[PDB]
Design an enzyme around this catalytic site. Structure first.
Site, PDB file in Angstrom:
ATOM      1  N   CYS A 158       3.123  -2.721  -5.098  1.00  0.00           N
ATOM      2  CA  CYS A 158       2.805  -4.533  -5.249  1.00  0.00           C
ATOM      3  C   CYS A 158       2.978  -4.752  -4.121  1.00  0.00           C
ATOM      4  O   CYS A 158       2.073  -3.857  -3.109  1.00  0.00           O
ATOM      5  CB  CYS A 158       4.681  -4.726  -6.221  1.00  0.00           C
ATOM      6  SG  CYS A 158       6.061  -3.042  -5.076  1.00  0.00           S
ATOM      7  N   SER A 159       3.979  -5.179  -3.191  1.00  0.00           N
ATOM      8  CA  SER A 159       3.625  -5.360  -1.763  1.00  0.00           C
ATOM      9  C   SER A 159       4.427  -4.438  -0.906  1.00  0.00           C
ATOM     10  O   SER A 159       3.952  -4.004  -0.269  1.00  0.00           O
ATOM     11  CB  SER A 159       4.444  -6.655  -1.505  1.00  0.00           C
ATOM     12  OG  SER A 159       3.867  -7.049  -0.063  1.00  0.00           O
ATOM     13  N   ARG A 188       8.670  -3.695  -8.306  1.00  0.00           N
ATOM     14  CA  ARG A 188       8.087  -4.216  -8.986  1.00  0.00           C
ATOM     15  C   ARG A 188       7.745  -2.956  -9.683  1.00  0.00           C
ATOM     16  O   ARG A 188       8.099  -2.686 -10.775  1.00  0.00           O
ATOM     17  CB  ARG A 188       6.839  -5.126  -8.710  1.00  0.00           C
ATOM     18  CG  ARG A 188       7.510  -7.203  -9.074  1.00  0.00           C
ATOM     19  CD  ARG A 188       6.362  -7.719  -8.531  1.00  0.00           C
ATOM     20  NE  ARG A 188       7.411  -8.688  -7.780  1.00  0.00           N
ATOM     21  CZ  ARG A 188       6.358  -9.863  -7.249  1.00  0.00           C
ATOM     22  NH1 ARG A 188       4.782 -10.160  -8.345  1.00  0.00           N
ATOM     23  NH2 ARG A 188       6.508 -11.136  -7.237  1.00  0.00           N
ATOM     24  N   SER A 189       6.886  -2.403  -8.506  1.00  0.00           N
ATOM     25  CA  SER A 189       6.427  -1.426  -8.592  1.00  0.00           C
ATOM     26  C   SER A 189       7.690   0.033  -9.260  1.00  0.00           C
ATOM     27  O   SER A 189       7.167   0.624 -10.089  1.00  0.00           O
ATOM     28  CB  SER A 189       6.123  -0.365  -7.460  1.00  0.00           C
ATOM     29  OG  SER A 189       4.878  -0.866  -7.222  1.00  0.00           O
ATOM     30  N   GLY A 224       5.837  -2.013  -2.483  1.00  0.00           N
ATOM     31  CA  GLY A 224       6.225  -0.532  -3.832  1.00  0.00           C
ATOM     32  C   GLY A 224       7.120   0.242  -3.601  1.00  0.00           C
ATOM     33  O   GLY A 224       6.931   0.875  -3.903  1.00  0.00           O
ATOM     34  N   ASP A 256       6.699 -15.760  -8.809  1.00  0.00           N
ATOM     35  CA  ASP A 256       7.144 -16.088  -6.991  1.00  0.00           C
ATOM     36  C   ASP A 256       8.278 -15.591  -7.372  1.00  0.00           C
ATOM     37  O   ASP A 256       8.255 -14.520  -5.393  1.00  0.00           O
ATOM     38  CB  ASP A 256       6.383 -17.289  -6.131  1.00  0.00           C
ATOM     39  CG  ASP A 256       4.855 -17.241  -5.983  1.00  0.00           C
ATOM     40  OD1 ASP A 256       4.604 -16.050  -5.998  1.00  0.00           O
ATOM     41  OD2 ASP A 256       4.413 -18.594  -5.175  1.00  0.00           O
ATOM     42  N   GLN A 259      14.831  -2.837  -5.896  1.00  0.00           N
ATOM     43  CA  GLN A 259      15.269  -3.741  -4.794  1.00  0.00           C
ATOM     44  C   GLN A 259      16.204  -5.481  -5.706  1.00  0.00           C
ATOM     45  O   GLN A 259      16.706  -5.518  -4.134  1.00  0.00           O
ATOM     46  CB  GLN A 259      14.276  -5.167  -4.072  1.00  0.00           C
ATOM     47  CG  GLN A 259      13.133  -4.477  -3.525  1.00  0.00           C
ATOM     48  CD  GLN A 259      11.873  -4.906  -3.293  1.00  0.00           C
ATOM     49  OE1 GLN A 259      10.770  -5.517  -4.371  1.00  0.00           O
ATOM     50  NE2 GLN A 259      11.899  -5.105  -1.843  1.00  0.00           N
TER      51      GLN A 259
END
Ligand code: JMA
EC number: 3.1.3.48
Length: 282
Positions: A215-216, A221-222, A218, A181, A262
């Site tokens: 991901c949320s 993580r993406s 994009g 998380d 990010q």
């Protein structure tokens, strides 16, 4: 500089935030006018994450062709990816329309539906074989065929049917279920194992349309997923693998979608993944 020793030099000097801010300063800025039209407000999850006009994926519709998704085309590596946000309640039908129209074989999901007590994307695939999903706005049917749950990820076989033509296709859903998380994983080993499972399936290969990864938002993580894949492929292709410059590859990818990677912790994790992955390849 090489990668592994540039890495220790940034760790010892504690300058990851400064390296990451340089990238943010040098990154491309292109227009995203279609994303900001008023009629598309409920098609964007975050007001500060938009696809550039020049690289956005267009839906094959004449009413409204907009989806928050970008084509990342890597010329030297000969790989393409579609990066997109986690689907919203009013864009699940658009999402599967894109998968169909772009001839993708695989969908890569790097988030859980709920994280930190909040919803990060819609429940956009069926959870039981006998309870299929119908998307009436785009005339598609989606059925769960099989599911294989492992300790760090789950693979699902799905059938997507175009109800207009009765054509069917098999889609593979690769779901990485253990990204924490907060922060990034301590070791890249399970993420690399996951990347190799996607590769082995054919979903990243030229005989299919581009893989869809999300991901949320994009971008975070993406971005880590496609950056690690492309860097490892370039190390296999070039005569001098130490010439691969992960910061330059990231800036090239940011010509096609804003904001990829990010945080400085995601940048460090991307370095770690490429470094460890290059030892296993040989
Ligand atoms: O041309 C390379 C073919 C084999 C590479 N490979 C197969 N399984 C792997 C698992 C991991 Cl973790 C890693 Cl890094 C690499 C792998």
């Amino acid at each position: 500089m090489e990668m592994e020793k540039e890495f220790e030099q940034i760790d010892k000097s504690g300058s990851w935030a400064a390296i990451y801010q340089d990238i943010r300063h040098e990154a491309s800025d292109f227009p995203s006018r279609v994303a900001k039209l008023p009629k598309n407000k409920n098609r964007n999850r975050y007001r500060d994450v938009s696809p550039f006009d020049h690289s956005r994926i267009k839906l094959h519709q004449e009413d409204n062709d907009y989806i928050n998704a970008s084509l990342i085309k890597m010329e030297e590596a000969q790989r393409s990816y579609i990066l997109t946000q986690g689907p919203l309640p009013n864009t699940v039908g658009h999402f599967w329309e894109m998968v169909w129209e772009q001839k993708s074989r695989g969908v890569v999901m790097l988030n859980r539906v709920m994280e930190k007590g909040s919803l990060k994307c819609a429940q956009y695939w069926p959870q039981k074989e006998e309870k299929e999903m119908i998307f009436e706005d785009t005339n598609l049917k989606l059925t769960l065929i099989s599911e294989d749950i492992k300790s760090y990820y789950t693979v699902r076989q799905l059938e997507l049917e175009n109800l207009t033509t009765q054509e069917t296709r098999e889609i593979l859903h690769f779901h990485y279920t253990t990204w924490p998380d907060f922060g990034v994983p301590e070791s890249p080993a399970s993420f690399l194992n996951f990347l190799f499972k996607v590769r082995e399936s054919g979903s990243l290969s030229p005989e299919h349309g581009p893989v869809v990864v999300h991901c949320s938002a994009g971008i975070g993580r993406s971005g880590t997923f496609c950056l690690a894949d492309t860097c490892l492929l370039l190390m296999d292709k070039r005569k001098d693998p130490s010439s691969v410059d992960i910061k330059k590859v990231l800036l090239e990818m940011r010509k096609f979608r804003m904001g990829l990677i990010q945080t400085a912790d995601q940048l460090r994790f991307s370095y770690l993944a490429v470094i460890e992955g290059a030892k296993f390849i040989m």
